[PDB]
Design an enzyme around this catalytic site. Structure first.
Site, mmCIF file in Angstrom:
data_model
loop_
_atom_site.group_PDB
_atom_site.id
_atom_site.type_symbol
_atom_site.label_atom_id
_atom_site.label_comp_id
_atom_site.label_asym_id
_atom_site.label_seq_id
_atom_site.Cartn_x
_atom_site.Cartn_y
_atom_site.Cartn_z
ATOM 1 N N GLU A 1 -8.139 5.079 -4.002
ATOM 2 C CA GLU A 1 -6.806 4.588 -4.325
ATOM 3 C C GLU A 1 -6.165 5.553 -5.310
ATOM 4 O O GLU A 1 -6.746 5.859 -6.355
ATOM 5 C CB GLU A 1 -6.821 3.190 -4.941
ATOM 6 N N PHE B 1 3.821 -7.444 -12.011
ATOM 7 C CA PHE B 1 2.972 -8.553 -11.606
ATOM 8 C C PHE B 1 3.783 -9.632 -10.906
ATOM 9 O O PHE B 1 4.866 -10.002 -11.369
ATOM 10 C CB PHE B 1 2.265 -9.147 -12.824
ATOM 11 N N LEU B 2 3.268 -10.115 -9.779
ATOM 12 C CA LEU B 2 3.853 -11.296 -9.175
ATOM 13 C C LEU B 2 3.579 -12.498 -10.080
ATOM 14 O O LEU B 2 2.615 -12.495 -10.852
ATOM 15 C CB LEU B 2 3.277 -11.528 -7.778
ATOM 16 N N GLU C 1 -0.319 -11.218 2.037
ATOM 17 C CA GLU C 1 -0.109 -12.435 1.266
ATOM 18 C C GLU C 1 1.289 -12.995 1.510
ATOM 19 O O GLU C 1 2.239 -12.259 1.801
ATOM 20 C CB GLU C 1 -0.322 -12.196 -0.233
ATOM 21 N N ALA D 1 2.016 -1.407 -11.926
ATOM 22 C CA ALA D 1 2.619 -2.245 -10.899
ATOM 23 C C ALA D 1 2.993 -3.597 -11.491
ATOM 24 O O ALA D 1 2.128 -4.312 -12.008
ATOM 25 C CB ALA D 1 1.667 -2.422 -9.717
ATOM 26 N N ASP E 1 -5.479 0.699 5.612
ATOM 27 C CA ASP E 1 -6.279 -0.359 5.006
ATOM 28 C C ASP E 1 -5.473 -1.643 4.844
ATOM 29 O O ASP E 1 -5.450 -2.234 3.759
ATOM 30 C CB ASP E 1 -6.822 0.111 3.653
ATOM 31 N N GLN F 1 -11.783 -1.172 -6.312
ATOM 32 C CA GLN F 1 -12.062 -0.043 -7.188
ATOM 33 C C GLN F 1 -11.480 -0.368 -8.556
ATOM 34 O O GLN F 1 -11.126 -1.523 -8.818
ATOM 35 C CB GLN F 1 -11.492 1.271 -6.648
#
Lengths: 378, 383, 385, 377
Positions: free
Chosen positions: A111, A196-197, A268, A194, A263, A74
Site C-alpha cells: 500500500e 475519517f468516516l 462498504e 485520510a 484489490d 498492513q
C-alpha cells in the site's frame, strides 16, 4: 487552467434530486461539516469549499494522539487532531520511481500513500465523490508519532538504524518487521492522512462481498475467470438487479482499472439508506503500482456485464478529448498537495492510455449489445 | 596475465613445515581428493590442480537429488551428485547492481551467492587457502530443483508467478515467503555451488566464539564496543596467547573487512589438530553487499590488538602495488566462473580502497607499538 | 476565510499622515488611477478597489502590441494594452516542481513568473504595499505574442519544435538560444504581467546600492561578509542615519529572506520625494526557487543592524499565530490568480518556517540590545491591539 | 546467454586473408590495438587485447589532461603513463533523464552513457567499427585539474555554494557556469574512448554522408521531401562501387537502434580507399529517448531498400528469445565501472526498435524481392 475548463462543462453541473428528511445520514469543525454533508447520493459535493478546507486541516492541524489499528492488513495509523476529528494514516512504503515487480501477486502488493491521495483527486475528477478526502503530509516521526502515543505496541518498535536514522515498523502481519521498517532521512517519513468516516457506532456500515472478488490464492482461479456468462447470473442475484447497484459496481470497476488497483474484494455502504445508495471507495492503496502495465483483469466485470451509466460514459468520453484529458487534469489538482509530485509522469500517461481502453471496451461492447441496453440514463 | 605475476613472486612460493603422521586429518572423485588434501596448516595449497578441476564438477556435474537444510537462517540447499559427493547451494537473492539498504542491520542482511564465490577467490589471492571451493552455476529450477527433490517442504513452495515465471522460497525465517520468492526468467535461477567439507561423522569440527562477536540486537552494545583496551585482555585469555591464533584471527578479520562481512559470530576449527591449526573461513554470504561504503567496525579487532602476520602484511602491501593490485588480480580469476561478472566493478574498486585502510591501520598502529611488537615474523628462514 | 480575519485586525488599519500638495508624485484607466495613487509613503492602499481591478485588466485586456526588453538577464516582453497602459511580461522559465540546483550561484539563477506574482501577495500581506501589481496570465503565443509584434528580432525566433509545439526564444544574453526556448503545449506559455510604474519622463527614480550587495563573483567575498560589526559604520554613512531607511532596508531584507531572493543588489526610490520615502520592491523573480533550503545569507543585515520597525515586528509576530499565519493567508490570496497554484505547498510552508527564524533573530537581538534600541516605535497614534 | 552467441556460426565467420596492404601499418595495449586495424574490421572478435585495453582506460594513471578546444560540447584529452591517450566525454545528464521532445537533434547533449553503450551494442552486432570505450569515475581535482597545463581549463574550476567541485571548460553549447559539471563532491565520471592512431601516421579522409540532416529549422533536408532520393544516390560516385551503400546501411541500422540522429559525417582511413569500413565515432547523441522511436533515422533504409545478408541474418538472430538483444546487452554492459550504463527501459526499447528494423526489412524485401535487396557474403 484546464481544471476550471472541466468544471464549466454542463456535465459537471448535474444537480441531485431533492434531499428529504431521510437522505441525510444524520460553521462546525471541518471534519464534522463533512459528516453532516454525507447524503444518499454522494459523500460531499463539487461546490463545497469545506472539502478544500478539510484537506488543509489534515496538512497542518496539530497531531494530538497516535494509535495503531491492531490486526490490520498492513501498517495503518490513526491520527487524532486537536479539534477532536481524526484521520487514517498510511506511511510511505515505496519510492516514487519504483514499480511493483511483475512476479508479485495482487495479494503481496504494498500500500502506497500516493494511491490513497491520487484516488481521491481522480475520483473528484470523475465526479463520483465517493472517497473521503485525503491529503499528503510530512510528519516529524519523532515529534508527531513516537513522542505522542500511549500505545506501547507502536512505541517499542522505534529504533535507530546504523545510518543514525529513525525507523519504525509497528505491528501488523505483512511487512511489519525490522527488515521492512520505515526510515526517515533522518526523522520525517511522509504519508497519507485520510479523513475519517463518521463513527461506526452512530452510522453503521454494511460490508458487502463483491461478486468479482478475486481468489486470494494462487493456482486456484475465481468463478468469473472460468465462466464467461458469469454476469447473466449476477444480474439475477439479490441486490444487483434493483439499483443503481450493478451500475454502481461499474463505476467502481472503471475507477479501479484506471489505477491498476486489483484489490477490490469488498465495498462498504451506509446501512441507513439501503440497497439504493452509493458505494464508498475505501482501501485504494493498491493502485498506481505499475504504470508500464494495464491490468485488464480489473475490467472483466465490464466486458461481462456490458452496462454503464450515461452520466459516467459521457464524462469518460470527455476526459479523452485533448482539451481536457485525464493526465493534465490530474497533474493540476495533485499539484496542490504537499507531497508533489504525487504521481510521476508515466503514471499520468497511463491514465490516458487506460482511459481509452475503457472507452474501447464500451464501444466494442456497445456494438455487440447496442445502446440503451448498455447505457442507462440518469 | 596479472594473476601469473602474483604466483611467481616469492611471497607466493612460501613452503610449509614438514607434515607428520598427524596434520593430515586422514590416512578418484575430485571432491574426495579435496578432502584428503586437508592438512593442519592449509586447506588445499596452490599446487593441487584438483581444486580447479573440482570447480568444474560443481559447474557441470549432474544434479541427482536436492534437499533442504531444516532450520537455516535463510534458504540453503544441499546438492548431491552422481559421484556421491555433495556441495552446498546458495541461490541468487540479490542482483549485481544492488546494495544493502543503509538502514539495515548486519543481521538483516541478505546472503548472496556473489559473496560465496568472490570470498573464495579473494582468499586464494591472499594465499590463505581457508575457504572451501565454490563455483557458480545456472540451474534449471524445474529439472534440477523441483523435479529432483523428495522434500515436501521445498516442493510445496514452488508456484508460477503472474509473469508466467517459476518461483519458490522454501521454509526458513529470513526472506522465505511469496513476497521474497526466487523467480527465474522464466526457469533459471543461478547460484553458488560450494564444495562440501568432509562429513562430520569422520571429521569433528570444534566451534569457537569469536571475541569481537557483535551484540546481535539493536540498542545493546558489545563488549569491545565500549573498551578500547579490550584486546589487552584477549591476548591473556586461554586459547589466544598460544598460537598462531590471535594472528589467525587477524588474518580473518582483515578478510572480512575487505568484503564488508560483519556477520562473523563464530569460527570453526578441525579439533583433530587442536588449538594449533588454521581457521576455516566459512559462510561469507554477508560480504560484498556495499561497495560505496567501508565498514570500520569489522576492523576494530585489528586496531585494538595491533599485531598481524608478516607473511600476510607483506602480501597486503604487495596487493597494493599497482603491478599486482586487488582489482586486476580479482577480476582476472572471477572471470573463470560461469557467472561472470560475479562482482560488479565498483566492488573490485572498493576492494582496493578497503585494502589501503588496512595498510594504513597497520602503519598508524606500527608507529605506536613499533615493529617486533606489531609484526610477528614467520618468514624466518624463507625466500 | 482566514484572509478576511487578517485585514480586520488593527495592525492593518494603520493610517497615513495627512497628504500635502507634495507627497503625491502628481473614469480613467485603472493603470493611471494606480499611478496617481502613488504617494510618498506607499504605492497603493489596502483596497482601493483600483488595484484589484488593475489585475483583472492584466488578465483579460486585449494585448495590442508586444515588444522585447533589450539587454536583460533573460527574456522580458512589454505588453501594451487597449487602453495605452503597459506591463512587464515574464514568461514561465521553471515548472512548479523544480528547485534551483544547489550548485547554482545567486547570479546564475533564473527568474520565474510564479515568484514575481507570489512576491506581490506576500508583500501585500506584510502591509508593505511596495511591489507593483502583478497578475498571472495564459497567453496564446500565436495570437498574443507572435502575430502582434513589429520587432522582427522577436518574430524571427518563432519556430516549430520536432514535437509540433510552438516555440520561441527572443534575443537577450546567455539564455536566449534555441536550446532555451519557451514552448507551449501546444501554443500556450503562461507568464506574469507586472504592472508598469509611471514613465521616467514624468516620474524620476533614484536607484540606490544596498550595502549588503553581494560580490557577484565566485571566490571573492563582499565587505559585510567578513566584518560582523559592518552596520556600526553603515548607520553613520549619509543616507542611512536619517530614516526610515535602515528601517526600510530591514523591511526589505526580511521580505527577501522569506522568499530566498538573494539578488537584491539595488533598490529604487521616487526622487520627487527625496531621501525620505519608501523603497519600491521591484523585480523579485529570484525568490521561491528553493523550498527545502533557507538561505541565511539574506538575514545578515538584520543580525548586524539589529533594529526593525515596531509596525512590521508586531505583524511578523501576528503572521505566526495559527489563527493567521503566512501559509494559509498566502495560498488564499494566491488562489485568486489565474495561474493556480502559483506556489506549491512546500514553498508556502517554508514561508512559515522562515518566518519563525526571523522572529527568532529579533528575540535574540531584542534581548541583547533591549527594546527601544532595537524596535523603533511608529505606532504612536495608531490603533491599539 | 552472451557465451552462446559467439558459439553460433554467425559470429565465427572468418575474414579474407590479409595481404601486405589491408593493414594500415608484447607492446602496450593501445598500440597492439592500432596494429590490429585492417580493411574489414577494427580489432577482430577474439582479441583479448580489446578486453585488456578496456581495463587500461579505466585504471591507468592519468598523467596529463588537455582540452580539444572549440568543439560542439566539452571533450577532454587524457594522456597516460604509457604514452597512449584517450578522449574523455564527461557526465552531462543522469541515467533517468530523457531529452525533451522539443529539442532538436542539434540541441541534444552528448553523454558518456551513449559512448559506452554504443561500443557494446556495436560489438554484439559483430560490426567492430567503434573504437573501444570504458566508463570511469575520475577524481576531478587529482585527475583533471591538478594534472593539466591548459590555462583555459584550469581557470574554469571553481567551488559551488554547495561546496562541490565544478568546471565547465570552453566549447560552444553548454560550456558556462549554468551548464557546469559538478561532482558530489569531487568525482564527475565519464567515458574514455581509446584514441585512433595519430592523423600524421594514419591519415583519415572525412566524408559527408548523403542523409545528413538539415541543421536548420523550417529548412528541410534533401532526402526529407524526395522519397526516391536513393534511386539517384546509388548512381553517384563512390556509393555503387562497394560495399559502401551496404556499409552505410550497417551504420544507419546501428544509429536507429540508439536514436542517434546526428550522423552528419562518417570517417574512413584513406590508406584503404573507397572499399573499406566506416569508423563509427562520437555516438554520444544516442540513448537520449527510450520511450520514443525516431523513424527519421531509418529513412535511408526504406529509400535504398538493400542490406547486407551478413547483417540481416544476425538481426533475425537477435530476435530469438534465447539471443534477445536486451538480455544479451545488459550482460556485456555489466562489465563496466559505470554500472548501470543504461537504465532498463533503454534496453527494452532496443528490443522494440530491433523488431521494427526487422519489419522494415520484411516490408522492403517483399517490394524489391530477395537477391535484389540482400547482398550475399
Amino acid at each position: 487552467s484546464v481544471l476550471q475548463s472541466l468544471f464549466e462543462h454542463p456535465l459537471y453541473r448535474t444537480v441531485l434530486p431533492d434531499l428529504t428528511e431521510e437522505d441525510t445520514l444524520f460553521s462546525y469543525p471541518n471534519w464534522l461539516r463533512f459528516h453532516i454533508g454525507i447524503n444518499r447520493y454522494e459523500l460531499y459535493s463539487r461546490h463545497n469549499p469545506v472539502i478544500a478546507a478539510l484537506l488543509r486541516d489534515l496538512l497542518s492541524q496539530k497531531i494530538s494522539s497516535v494509535g495503531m489499528k491492531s490486526g490490520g492488513t498492513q501498517l495503518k495509523l490513526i491520527m487524532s487532531f486537536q479539534n477532536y476529528g481524526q484521520a487514517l494514516f498510511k506511511p510511505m512504503k515505496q519510492t516514487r520511481e519504483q514499480e511493483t515487480p511483475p512476479d508479485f501477486f495482487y495479494f503481496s502488493d504494498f500500500e502506497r500513500h500516493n494511491a490513497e491521495i491520487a484516488a481521491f483527486h481522480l475520483d473528484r475528477i470523475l465526479d463520483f465523490r465517493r472517497v473521503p478526502p485525503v491529503a499528503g503530509r510530512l510528519v516529524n516521526m519523532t515529534r508527531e508519532i513516537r513522542d505522542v502515543t500511549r500505545d506501547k505496541k507502536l512505541w517499542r518498535t522505534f529504533f535507530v538504524s546504523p545510518a543514525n536514522n529513525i525507523c519504525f515498523y509497528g505491528e501488523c502481519s505483512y511487512y511489519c518487521s525490522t527488515e521492512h521498517a520505515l526510515c526517515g532521512k533522518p526523522d520525517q517519513i511522509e504519508g497519507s492522512l485520510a479523513a475519517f468516516l463518521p463513527d461506526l457506532a452512530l452510522a453503521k456500515r454494511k460490508t458487502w462481498r463483491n461478486p468479482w472478488r478475486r481468489s486470494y490464492h494462487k493456482r486456484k482461479k475465481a468463478e468469473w475467470e472460468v465462466d464467461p456468462d458469469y454476469c447473466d447470473e449476477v444480474k439475477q442475484t439479490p441486490p444487483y438487479d434493483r439499483g443503481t447497484r450493478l451500475l454502481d459496481i461499474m463505476d467502481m470497476t472503471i475507477f479501479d482499472f484506471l489505477m491498476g488497483n486489483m484489490d477490490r474484494h469488498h465495498y462498504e455502504t451506509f446501512e441507513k439508506f439501503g440497497n439504493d445508495t452509493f458505494i464508498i471507495h475505501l482501501d485504494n492503496g493498491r493502485g498506481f503500482g505499475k504504470h508500464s502495465h494495464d491490468e485488464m483483469s480489473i475490467l472483466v466485470p465490464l466486458t461481462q456485464c456490458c452496462r454503464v451509466k450515461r452520466s459516467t460514459y459521457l464524462r469518460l468520453q470527455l476526459l479523452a478529448k485533448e482539451e481536457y484529458k485525464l493526465s493534465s487534469l490530474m497533474e493540476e489538482s495533485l499539484l496542490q498537495d504537499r507531497l508533489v509530485p504525487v504521481l510521476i509522469k508515466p503514471h499520468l500517461e497511463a491514465l490516458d492510455r487506460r482511459l481509452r481502453l475503457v472507452l474501447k471496451v464500451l464501444s466494442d461492447c456497445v456494438e455487440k449489445d447496442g445502446f440503451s441496453a448498455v447505457v442507462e440514463n440518469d
